[PDB]
Design a protein around this ligand. Structure first.
Ligand code: 6EV
Ligand code: 6EV
Ligand code: 6EV
Ligand code: 6EV
Ligand code: 6EV
Ligand code: 6EV
Lengths: 261, 261
C-alpha cells in the first residue's frame, strides 16, 4: 500500500531467555497432558494451564521472554495439543528454533509463526474458551516459604485414590507437619530454611500423587518454594516457585473430608 | 485483482487413495533415514528416495494419489527430515489429515500446505539437489518375478559387513539359488510361483542386511515381486513390488568381489 505502514499486533518470543527457560522446563513440557492450554496476553505474558481433577497447574513466562509490538493484541488461548503437530510447546523447545511469534489477525484464531535456519512455518489454531481465569489474587491464611533444600527433602521423603498427605500447621510456636497415611510425619520448625510469614493452627488433606507432582514441578527452579493455604471459599493449597524467566504455580483442592455427601 | 484468474501450480494429494497408501506404508515411513528425499513432479508423481552405502531405495506414488492443477508445476525435491517437524512424510500419515497439497510459488523452495479439522499449516523447505536421477530405464539381463508366497519364504528363511548372500541363476533349465555364507542354499525352479522371463547363467553377491531390508520393503504390497540383475555398467540387483497406489523399488550394487583394489 501507499499510505502509512501497518503490521498486525505481534507477540514475539525473545529467543535467548525463552530458549533458556524452555530447556530448563523441557521435562515438564513433554509431559504436558492432552488438555493443556496456551494463553498469549498483551501484558505481555505466556501461560500454560492444565486443569485436572483436583489440581490446576500453571506455567507463566514473564516479560523477559516476550516482546509485544502493539498492546491492542487480543488475548488468545489455544490448545497445546495440536491436530497434526501434537505437543505445540514441545515443538518450540527445538534447538534450532530461530523465530517464534504469534499474531492477532483474526478474533477467531491465532497465527503462530516459527522459524529455523532455512525453514519457516505457520499455522493457526482455533481460540478456545475461556475465559479460564483461575488465579491467586487472594491472599494466604497460612503462608510458608521453603528453601529449596527443604523442597528436595520433602521430595526425597515422599519417595516413592492412591493416597493422601495431611498437612498440619502450628501457630504457637510455628511449625509445619507433613503426615503420611502410614504413621510417618515430617516436620519443619523455625530455622534459616523455612520462613513462616502468616500462620494459624489448621490442617487440610490433599491427594498425594498431585502434591508430589506439584513439588516436582516447582523444583525445576532449584529456588525457594511458596506454600499457601488459601481459605477463600474452596479450601485451597497453593504451591509455587519462580525465577526471572517463569513461574510454576499449583492450586490443589482439599480432598472433601468433612461430611461428605 | 480484476483481470483473469490465476492460482499458482498446485500438486494435491487425493486423500482416500493417498491415506490408504500411507497407512499400508506407515511401517516404512517412520523408519525413513535422516537423509531421505521427497520429490514432487508435474507428471504427477511423488517419490521418496533414500541413498545408502550400496543401496538406493525408492517409493513412487502413482497418479491415482495425485491431482495437478497445472503442468507448469516445476519439479521439487526437498529433505524429508524437516528442521522443526522431523519426519515430514510421517506427519502426512496422520489420521485427521484433510488436505495436503504442494505449490510452486518460488523456484527456490516448495510450499507445503496441510489441513486437519479446525487447523491448517504451511511451511516451505529449500529445494535440494539434484537432480538425483537414479532410475530403472535399463532392461534386465536376468528377470524373475516371484509370487508373494515366495517373497515370504525368502524372508522367513533369512530369519534372522554383517554378511553377504550370493544369488545364482541357472539357464538350462532355469532356476534361482540363494546361497548363504553358512552353506545353506534356497532354490526355486520353474513352477506356478516363480516366472523366469529372461535368464542367463550368472551370479552376483550383495550385502545380506540390505537384501533383507529390500525384501521387507517389497512385502508391504503382499503382491508379486520383481527380481532383476541389470548388467548395464555397475553390476546391479533390482528388487521391486507395486500395487495401484505405489511402487517400492530397490537398487543394490554387487559387493566388489572380483579384484579388488
Ligand atoms: C504432630 C502432632 C502434635 C505433637 C504430638 C505429640 S504426640 C503426637 S501423636 C498423636 C503428636 C502429633 O501427632
Ligand atoms: C547350486 C549348485 C549347482 C548344483 C550342485 C550340485 S552339487 C553342488 S555343491 C558345490 C551344487 C551347487 O552348489
Ligand atoms: C504501488 C506500490 C508502492 C511501492 C512498491 C514497491 S514495489 C511494488 S509492486 C508493483 C510497489 C507497489 O505496489
Ligand atoms: C491464570 C490464567 C489461566 C489461563 C487464562 C486464560 S485468559 C487469562 S487472563 C487473566 C488466563 C490466565 O491468566
Ligand atoms: C477491486 C476488487 C475487485 C473485487 C473485490 C471484491 S471484495 C474486494 S476488497 C476491496 C474486491 C477488490 O479488491
Ligand atoms: C528416480 C528419481 C529419484 C529422485 C528424483 C529427483 S528428480 C527426479 S525426475 C527423473 C527424480 C526421480 O524420478
Amino acid at each position: 500500500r501507499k499510505d502509512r505502514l501497518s503490521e498486525p499486533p505481534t507477540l514475539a518470543l525473545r529467543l535467548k531467555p525463552y530458549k533458556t527457560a524452555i530447556q530448563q522446563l523441557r521435562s515438564v513440557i513433554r509431559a504436558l497432558k492432552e488438555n493443556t492450554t496456551v494463553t498469549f496476553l498483551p501484558t505481555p505474558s505466556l501461560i500454560l494451564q492444565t486443569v485436572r481433577s483436583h489440581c490446576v497447574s500453571k506455567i507463566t513466562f514473564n516479560s523477559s521472554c516476550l516482546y509485544i509490538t502493539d498492546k491492542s493484541f487480543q488475548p488468545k488461548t489455544i490448545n497445546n495439543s495440536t491436530p497434526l503437530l501434537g505437543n505445540f510447546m514441545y515443538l518450540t523447545s527445538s534447538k534450532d528454533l530461530t523465530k517464534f511469534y504469534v499474531q492477532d489477525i483474526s478474533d477467531l484464531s491465532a497465527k503462530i509463526s516459527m522459524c529455523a535456519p532455512d525453514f519457516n512455518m505457520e499455522f493457526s489454531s482455533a481460540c478456545v474458551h475461556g475465559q479460564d481465569i483461575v488465579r491467586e489474587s487472594e491472599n494466604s491464611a497460612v503462608h510458608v516459604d521453603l528453601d529449596f533444600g527443604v523442597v528436595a527433602d520433602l521430595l526425597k521423603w515422599i519417595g516413592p485414590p492412591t493416597g493422601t498427605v495431611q498437612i498440619l500447621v502450628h501457630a504457637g510456636p510455628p511449625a509445619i507437619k507433613f503426615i503420611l497415611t502410614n504413621g510417618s510425619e515430617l516436620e519443619f520448625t523455625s530455622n534459616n530454611r523455612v520462613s513462616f510469614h502468616g500462620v494459624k493452627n489448621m490442617r487440610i488433606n490433599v491427594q498425594l500423587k498431585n502434591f508430589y507432582q506439584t513439588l516436582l514441578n516447582c523444583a525445576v527452579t532449584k529456588l525457594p518454594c511458596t506454600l499457601r493455604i488459601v481459605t477463600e471459599h474452596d479450601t485451597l493449597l497453593y504451591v509455587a516457585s519462580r525465577n526471572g524467566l517463569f513461574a510454576v504455580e499449583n492450586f490443589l483442592t482439599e480432598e472433601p473430608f468433612q461430611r461428605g455427601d
